[PDB]
Structures are given as C-alpha cells and as structure tokens.
C-alpha cells in the first residue's frame, strides 16, 4: 500500500462507529468508478482493519496495539525487536 494508518480507539463500540463512518463517507466521497471495500475483523472484538485501494487503516484497542506493535515493524522494516528474535536453523542427526 502507499500509506499505512494505525489508530487507537477507546472501546469496541467506538471502533465500530469509526469504521462505519469512514465507509459511509468513502462511498459518498466520489469513488464512483472505484470498487467497494470490505470491513474486516467484525468477528474480532478489538481489532478492525479496512483496506482501501491505496491505504490500509487498522483500528485496535490500546492493549492490542501494544502487543502487536504494528508501528515498529513498518517503521523499522528489518530491525524490529520481535523480528530479531526469530532466527534460522538446520537439521543435523543426533549422535
């Protein structure tokens, strides 16, 4: 995507309201030729993600944002602390 957007929300209710408002405005605001966008994560109760053609928005609760740390990964593409801990291995026989 061209732009990656992450925004926290007060509660689950607030999260649903923000997602619905953006989609409603998106359809109203032109995009007549452009196709439609799904709302993903409704089954999820704390993290909702909407992927527009050139932008992706992830709305999640504070604790979910803290655990996943999406900001760090995309800011630091290959130097994320969690990524660093993931090493590589091989498979030798045991003797």
């Amino acid at each position: 995507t061209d732009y990656f957007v992450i925004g926290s929300g007060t509660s689950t209710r607030h999260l649903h309201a923000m997602v619905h408002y953006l989609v409603k405005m998106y359809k109203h605001l032109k995009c007549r030729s452009d196709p439609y966008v799904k709302i993903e994560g409704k089954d999820a109760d704390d993290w909702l993600c909407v992927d527009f053609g050139s932008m992706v928005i992830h709305l999640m609760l504070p604790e979910t944002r803290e655990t996943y740390e999406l900001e760090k990964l995309w800011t630091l593409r290959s130097f994320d602390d969690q990524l660093a801990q993931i090493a590589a291995e091989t498979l030798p026989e045991d003797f």
Binding site: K38, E40, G41, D43, A44, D45, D46, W47, C49, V50, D51, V56, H58, T64, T67, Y68, E69, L70, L73, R77, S78, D80, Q82, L83, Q85, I86
Partner: protein
C-alpha cells in the same frame, strides 16, 4: 494441496508452534466445500493436544503461472476471533492473499516479506 491428516509447518513466532515438539501439527479439517486446501484457505489443526484454526500461506503443489511454489506447506495460526496468534512472520508470503475473497489484511500486516 492440503487435506485431512497432512503435516504442516507453523511459520509464526507464536509459542504454540515455535516450541520444539516431537510431533508436527496435522490438519483435521479443511474449511471448504472442496476437501482440498490451497493458498488462502483456512484449516483446523491438531497441535499439541489442542484444536486451533490456521491459514495456509503456501504449499508445494503447483499453481497457476506467475505464482510462487514453496518447498514446504506453510501455515499461520489464527485465534477463534480471527486475530493472528503470532505477532511476526519472517518467511515470504505470496501477494495473492490480498485479493482473495476473505479477511487477510491482518495477516498481511504481520508479514514483512512478500513474494
């Protein structure tokens, strides 16, 4: 192609998979009307006595031209609510997952490398 009783490689950093255990995970169910599982198709694993949902992110069977064939059947674990269990994926993931009908944006966010 993943079926019932296939052996799978968890490609997350989640403890459920990451931890070395003498038995690999085996597929118990493929969520399709077709029994076969391809890229982007969910499956139910039996991993360490636990039944856990997962998503296929690559397989050894050939696909259509211009798509990547992997050497192992790769899978990511997703929670019941649909949020990924693990927080990082360092293995390349095909970009076809974006346009397949379904919810894959959460997994794509967690994946740094795309092929």
């Amino acid at each position: 192609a993943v079926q019932k009783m296939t052996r799978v490689r968890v490609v997350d950093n989640s403890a459920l998979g990451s931890t070395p255990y003498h038995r690999p995970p085996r597929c118990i169910h493929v969520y399709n009307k077709s029994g076969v599982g391809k890229v982007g198709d969910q499956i139910l694993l039996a991993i360490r006595g636990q039944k856990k949902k997962a998503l296929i992110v690559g397989h050894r069977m050939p696909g259509s031209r211009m798509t990547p064939k992997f050497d192992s059947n790769n899978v990511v674990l997703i929670e019941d609510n649909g949020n990924p269990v693990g927080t990082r994926i360092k293995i390349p993931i095909p970009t076809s997952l974006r346009r397949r009908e379904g919810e894959y944006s959460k997994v794509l966010a967690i994946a740094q490398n795309f092929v």
